[PDB]
Amino acid sequence: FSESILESLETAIITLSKDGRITEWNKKAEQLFGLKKENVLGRRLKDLPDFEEIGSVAESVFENKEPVFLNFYKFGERYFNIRFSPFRNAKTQLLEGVIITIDDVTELYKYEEERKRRERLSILGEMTARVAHEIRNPITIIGGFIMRMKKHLDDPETLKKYINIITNELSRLETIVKEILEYSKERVLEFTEFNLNELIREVYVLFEEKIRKMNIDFCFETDNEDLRVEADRTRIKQVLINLVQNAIEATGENGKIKITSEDMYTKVRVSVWNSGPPIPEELKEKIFSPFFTTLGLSICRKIIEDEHGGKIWTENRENGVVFIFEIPKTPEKR
């Protein structure tokens, strides 16, 4: 709130008022987008090339209100982090303008790339092999049945369950393989505030029809119904998907699944406990690396663990096992 001489010897900032027009184009902003304040002053922000969405983000911010932090945005050769913050003018208190803050980022993500990706090569060696093996195994069956069913000819149709589902069990393994092949090629990250439980439910909603099939005494408790978190919704989404996914058959027929979201002063704890066969002392960590069971956690490690931060570990209990993670509300604590 004054001064505004200081205003411009720092990182970078842009103001979009009730259309998308700029009032102040920071001096370090210039030093990033090649043009000076004056010859861009009071212009619209979508007007610029290779640019676009930045506006479209401010747009739906104008309509949803609530601000955003982004992480991972490719502009030309540089990667980016951006910070959106809509505000109001206290004299009017109207629905005034939007503050886009930008952190000088590249001389960072490229120097925590080489302590990550250069180590991502290695596991994509041993594992590439060890799992590339798990490829042929149903391959030789699915391909093999094609050199088995094609000499009857035309079976009493009963060769459809034993064809599709065995073809299908490798198919979603191809998925849960390509999905791990993702774990090499990326690195977007999109942080938002939202009620966790509002997510928690949301997921179960989708599964429902099947959980309803396997007559499951599902059970969800929480000590708080008002629980918010800054994080990538779209993504901490998957995380749930796949604890749940596993604790689906992992307890299976007439099996039970208990979800728990417990508020703690600075951090939250979501847990998916199921019953039946636990897993021993050795596999407390040793399922974390790509490795599958008699699963495919993998990503779900680095999602909580490396993306947001925190932990995604597990334990035995109550003649069953649980899948727990913890991420502080605001990642701004790191």
């Binding site: 676009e52 969405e53 490719k74 502009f75 198919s171 993702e182 977007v188 993504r235």
Partner: protein
């Protein structure tokens, strides 16, 4: 009746989808490269488009961006050969993201959606 323009690299992969969407209730006009996908959209009427990425000419990424700037209310479904969870910056300009598996029952639900 609706008409869709579906674009991909391999000749064997295009012929597969054409006759999967003509099953649901559509007519498919097939295009090959991004420079010929542009010409197949300009002087006509097309309510949807399905695109890859890693292709000769230009990237399906940049391709979709050419459809957005011209036609403001264009319908862009991305479905590249390497599909996961919409994680590149350019795709937010594009509408919906489809994951390429032999499973064709995801695109059908989402082609059907973006036509109302």
């Amino acid at each position: 009746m609706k008409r869709i323009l579906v674009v991909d690299d391999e000749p064997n992969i295009r012929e597969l989808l054409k006759e999967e969407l003509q099953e649901e209730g559509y007519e498919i006009d097939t295009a090959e490269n991004g420079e010929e996908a542009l010409k197949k959209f300009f002087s006509g009427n097309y309510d949807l488009v399905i695109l890859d990425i890693e292709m000769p000419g230009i990237s399906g990424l940049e391709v979709a961006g050419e459809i957005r700037k011209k036609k403001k209310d264009a319908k862009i479904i991305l479905l590249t050969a390497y599909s996961h969870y919409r994680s590149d910056m350019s795709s937010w300009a594009a509408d919906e993201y489809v994951v390429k598996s032999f499973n064709f029952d995801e695109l059908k639900e989402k082609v059907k959606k973006l036509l109302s």
